[PDB]
């Protein structure tokens, strides 16, 4: 329709996501997470890749101050779930080595940790090291958005024909 799960996307190439995709998503993800929490729509935890919609027009949305859910753990939940669609079925000898600002952006919201960055509180600090990626930090909101679009495009050239 107007959306593929990260699920589907994984299981349509059998190949893991490459790194841009990955910070993409993060951003993306993190930016709609923040929107939904203003809007007071309820955190929930990323238990699977099936819960993460990437769009058609490269949205990606999270489907089913305090409270039964921090940020951090929804920011953890993803950070896990990316690390597995990057290692997306790879034997453990041909296992994966991320780019040094990668790894540390996904150890870092996973919580399994200049070269050492300081502790990721919210969605702005996770969007801000996706950001900083990029020569011009200001391009994120297009580039990210971007990556996702073309993600999306390729992906339902398969999924649209099996």
Not at 30 to 39: D, E, N, Q, T, V
Not at 53 to 58: E, H, I, K, P, T
Not at 102 to 117: C, S, W
Request: glycine share 4%.
């Amino acid at each position: 329709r107007d959306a593929l799960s990260l699920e589907e996307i994984l299981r349509l190439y059998n190949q893991p996501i490459n790194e841009e995709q990955a910070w993409a998503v993060c951003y993306q993800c993190c930016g709609s997470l923040r929107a939904a929490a203003r809007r007071r729509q309820p955190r929930h935890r990323v238990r699977s890749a099936a819960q993460i919609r990437v769009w058609r027009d490269g949205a990606v949305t999270l489907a089913p101050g305090y409270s039964q859910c921090m940020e951090t753990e929804v920011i953890e939940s993803l950070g896990i779930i990316i690390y597995k669609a990057l290692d997306y079925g790879l034997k453990e000898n041909e296992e994966r080595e991320l780019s040094p600002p990668l790894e540390q952006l996904i150890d870092h919201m996973a919580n399994t940790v200049k070269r050492k960055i300081s502790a990721i509180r919210s969605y702005r600090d996770v969007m801000k090291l996706c950001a900083a990626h990029l020569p011009t930090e200001s391009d994120a909101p297009n580039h990210y958005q971007a990556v996702c679009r073309a993600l999306f495009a390729e992906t339902m050239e398969l999924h649209t024909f099996l």
